[PDB]
Design a protein around this ligand. Sequence first.
Ligand SMILES: CCCCCCCCCCC[C@H](CC(=O)O)c1c(C)c(C)cc2c1nc1c(=O)[nH]c(=O)nc-1n2C[C@H](O)[C@H](O)[C@H](O)COP(=O)(O)O
Ligand SMILES: CCCCCCCCCCC[C@H](CC(=O)O)c1c(C)c(C)cc2c1nc1c(=O)[nH]c(=O)nc-1n2C[C@H](O)[C@H](O)[C@H](O)COP(=O)(O)O
Ligand SMILES: CCCCCCCCCCC[C@H](CC(=O)O)c1c(C)c(C)cc2c1nc1c(=O)[nH]c(=O)nc-1n2C[C@H](O)[C@H](O)[C@H](O)COP(=O)(O)O
Ligand SMILES: CCCCCCCCCCC[C@H](CC(=O)O)c1c(C)c(C)cc2c1nc1c(=O)[nH]c(=O)nc-1n2C[C@H](O)[C@H](O)[C@H](O)COP(=O)(O)O
Lengths: 228, 228
Amino acid sequence: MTKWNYGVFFLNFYHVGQQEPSLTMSNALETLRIIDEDTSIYDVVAFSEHHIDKSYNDETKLAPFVSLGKQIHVLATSPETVVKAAKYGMPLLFKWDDSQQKRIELLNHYQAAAAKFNVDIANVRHRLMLFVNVNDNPTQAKAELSIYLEDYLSYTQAETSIDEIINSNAAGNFDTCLHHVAEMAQGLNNKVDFLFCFESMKDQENKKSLMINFDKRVINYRKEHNLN
Amino acid sequence: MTKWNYGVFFLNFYHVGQQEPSLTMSNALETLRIIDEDTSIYDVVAFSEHHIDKSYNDETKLAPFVSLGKQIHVLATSPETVVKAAKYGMPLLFKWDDSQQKRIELLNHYQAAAAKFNVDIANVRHRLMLFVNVNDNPTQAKAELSIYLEDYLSYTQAETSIDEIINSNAAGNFDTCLHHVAEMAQGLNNKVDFLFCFESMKDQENKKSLMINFDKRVINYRKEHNLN
Ligand SMILES: CCCCCCCCCCC[C@H](CC(=O)O)c1c(C)c(C)cc2c1nc1c(=O)[nH]c(=O)nc-1n2C[C@H](O)[C@H](O)[C@H](O)COP(=O)(O)O
Ligand SMILES: CCCCCCCCCCC[C@H](CC(=O)O)c1c(C)c(C)cc2c1nc1c(=O)[nH]c(=O)nc-1n2C[C@H](O)[C@H](O)[C@H](O)COP(=O)(O)O
Ligand SMILES: CCCCCCCCCCC[C@H](CC(=O)O)c1c(C)c(C)cc2c1nc1c(=O)[nH]c(=O)nc-1n2C[C@H](O)[C@H](O)[C@H](O)COP(=O)(O)O
Ligand SMILES: CCCCCCCCCCC[C@H](CC(=O)O)c1c(C)c(C)cc2c1nc1c(=O)[nH]c(=O)nc-1n2C[C@H](O)[C@H](O)[C@H](O)COP(=O)(O)O
């Protein structure tokens, strides 16, 4: 057992769930407010911005480094990129928009690389980005996540299937999400810390209540298991 | 008096001071190593990546948000962007590649905006990115910084003058840099925390020694002034 770390991410995209930009902005500021004043477990913030091509004039690409606090992660963008991270034993950052199956393929490819280069990654913990929508009515959590993501999936011309996206993220009641996320972590050898995106939750009070309930549960768990 | 915060940044660019990429990479990992094991003041890490255009298909641009730890900053890319940050009282991130004169214009434009919107920014602290090259021989610090930046300035087709860039950053002996940086902060109303880029220092031991000496000096200062 080890202490699992949590954080938050924001999707840097202007059109989500037919919301006007200033509404999306306002919702995001509330999330920030909750992290700063209402809770203590949300350690770092990151942005999802891989929908934009970041290339130089000669077609070489910006290196996909992401800092989380003082820790540098490499966005797991392709099997080749994960091998470059393995060369230095650097932690990965898994995309929320990759299916769980793809994430697992990528982590194992990384593990194969390290073994091949003889790099000790025993202590490396990666980060997994997940969209989280918790609703007492499971159907409503899913509908909300779906509506939120429609323009982005359309923009990115995703092959995916919103179904898969949903299955690879966390939409449902609290208990279902807890378990589903633990399952996904297991799928990734329990080597992943997390970044959650709560922006699909339309109700700000529900978002607040969820973030605070989870904060308290994690603090208790850490204490109970001598994880702090 | 207030506690000034420090961090580090890396320039996400492959060609610096005629170094092969793996050498630049290796130097950067040493910086990370020093921050994690040898010191405690370097709080956050960021990347300089504004040399790449980040636009959508319709010519709209990615919003220039940067997270530092759990704090969201807006890159001060233009007077209009700074007004958008002022609307919400968000902190700015000043570019190392803007002359000091331009930074001062931008901060005051931000302050004018906030006053106009009646937004209280009393408590806001911004972050300033600076390249730091400390050498007992002042001439050598400058030459090193100049050689390091030549390809980047050329790529960005900077209007600037490496001279100005140098004057707006910190190259020289330790005491000169301490004072020069304090001066720049004063120019920005003492409302700036910092991000330093040490990558132009060719000698890894000198880089290490500098980072550790500064760490100790800051800890003492904080204690002496009841800043912690
Ligand atoms: C607002 C967010 C809602 C979305 C939900 C996100 C869920 C986050 C992951 C779950 C955290 C649980 C702990 C907690 O309540 O804080 C949790 C759960 C629900 C489950 C089923 C298993 C967990 C777990 N948390 C763990 C943790 O922090 N550290 C661990 O080491 N293990 C955790 N586990 C057990 C895990 O599934 C594995 O069984 C063990 O890691 C295996 O260890 P071993 O026996 O030593 O090999
Ligand atoms: C602690 C981190 C600080 C970073 C400081 C900036 C240093 C830049 C030099 C990086 C050199 C690496 C090469 C090596 O083996 O050492 C490197 C790395 C680690 C990564 C992740 C990507 C790199 C890369 N070097 C490149 C280079 O010299 N020239 C390139 O043209 N591209 C390089 N890349 C990018 C990589 O080749 C891929 O194009 C991107 O990862 C995008 O991949 P995709 O989308 O998955 O296809
Ligand atoms: C490896 C890096 C080398 C590059 C050098 C970076 C320099 C960083 C800025 C300087 C930090 C000094 C403190 C320290 O040693 O840790 C410092 C210096 C050198 C000077 C000349 C003035 C400083 C100062 N640090 C300050 C700080 O942390 N907090 C403050 O509030 N004030 C500092 N000052 C004084 C400042 O110039 C102003 O006089 C006061 O802020 C004015 O306050 P007021 O009277 O209450 O209005
Ligand atoms: C706590 C932060 C979490 C972020 C979550 C993502 C939210 C995205 C919505 C942002 C809406 C803003 C508009 C408003 O007044 O509320 C906003 C902001 C704050 C900023 C900094 C830039 C924005 C922007 N909204 C835009 C929009 O709706 N449509 C656009 O096409 N562009 C927007 N921009 C970008 C801005 O207009 C500039 O193009 C960029 O700042 C680049 O500027 P330049 O390089 O300085 O020219």
